[PDB]
Amino acid sequence: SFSGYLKLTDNVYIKNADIVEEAKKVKPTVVVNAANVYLKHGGGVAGALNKATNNAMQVESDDYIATNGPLKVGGSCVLSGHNLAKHCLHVVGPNVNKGEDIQLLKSAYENFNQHEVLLAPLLSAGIFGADPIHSLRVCVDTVRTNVYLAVFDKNLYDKLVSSFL
Ligand SMILES: COc1ccc2[nH]cc(CN(C)C)c2c1
């Protein structure tokens, strides 16, 4: 099970960790991907998770998009977790760098409530351009299931913990 996490609330935990390394170690039931609507896993968390699957995530994702079309911003889909988890919950947080409504971050986090326990990154953080402090706040105030947050950057992790109300 999950080790070395700092407990923020009744159900939200946080750790300074590489989500790929964490997923390979824990083999959780669900790992969350910071997906885009096209499931094009090019960079950030998505690029890293996909590279860890030797591109099997991208191949599965392209078939999913060919069949279903793009996801909605704020939406999700469950696909295989490959060598990282039982499942991957691809969740699309708004990309501030694409001018997407930051208000959609709460809708994005609501997808986590369909899973009792998840390993996840902060949605819309990193290359998605949102303030990670705000993302953690929305996470805590939206997710009711058990979420283990992996924050890659130590400096950001320390800032998130030290500023957590
Ligand atoms: C039936 O073959 C394809 C191949 C690629 C595709 N990309 C998107 C679609 C259309 N689908 C969303 C209905 C598609 C179909």
69 CB-near residues (< 8 Å, 6+ apart): none
Per DSSP, the residues of 105-153 read: HHHHHHGGGGSSEEEEPPTT-GGG---HHHHHHHHHHH--SEEEEEES-
Widest pairwise Cα distance in the chain? 45
HSE toward the beta carbon, residue 20, CA cutoff 13 A: 11
What are the angstrom distances between the C-alpha of 137 and each of 8, 40, 115, 134, 143? Answer: 11, 27, 19, 5, 10
Q: Which of 113, 145, 139, 107 minimizes the C-alpha distance to 125?
A: 139
Question: Using CA positions, which residue lies closest to atom 3 of ligand 1?
Answer: 66
Experimental method: X-ray
Question: Using CA positions, which residue lies closest to atom 10 of ligand 1?
Answer: 66
Block residue for tokens 């790992």: 31
What are the angstrom distances between the C-alpha of 150 and each of 31, 60, 98, 140? Answer: 10, 24, 24, 14
Q: What's the CA angle centered on 82, arms 137 and 135, to 5 degrees?
A: 10
Q: Could you give the CA distance from residue 135 to residue 125 in angstroms, rounded to a whole number?
A: 7
Q: Give distance in angstroms: CA of 99 to centre of ligand 1.
A: 27
Per DSSP, the residues of 12-53 read: EEEEE--HHHHHHHH--SEEEEE--TT----SHHHHHHHHHT
Query: Ligand 1 test: best mutation among 62, 65, 68, most atoms within 8 Å of CB?
Result: 65
Q: Which of 160, 127, 115, 112 minimizes the C-alpha distance to 48?
A: 127
Q: Could you give the CA distance from residue 82 to residue 112 in angstroms, rounded to a whole number?
A: 19
Report strand pairing: 117-120 vs 146-151: parallel
Single-letter code of the amino acid located at 159: K
The domain locations on the chain are: 1-165
For this experimental structure, what is the resolution in angstroms? 1.1
| CA 75, 130, 165, 46 torsion-angle sign | positive
HSE toward the beta carbon, residue 157, CA cutoff 13 A: 15
Label residues 109-140 b or e (16+ Cβ within 10 Å = b). Answer: bbbbeebeebbbbbbbbbbbbbebeebbbbbb
94 CB-near residues (< 8 Å, 6+ apart): 73, 74, 100, 101, 102, 103, 104, 105, 108, 124, 128, 130
Please say whether the beta carbons of 131 and 105 come within 8 A: no
Q: In 3-state terms, what secondary structure has residue 89?
A: strand
Q: Could you give the CA distance from residue 25 to residue 148 in angstroms, rounded to a whole number?
A: 13
Q: Give distance in angstroms: CA of 36 to centre of ligand 1.
A: 17
| CA 125, 119, 30, 135 torsion-angle sign | negative
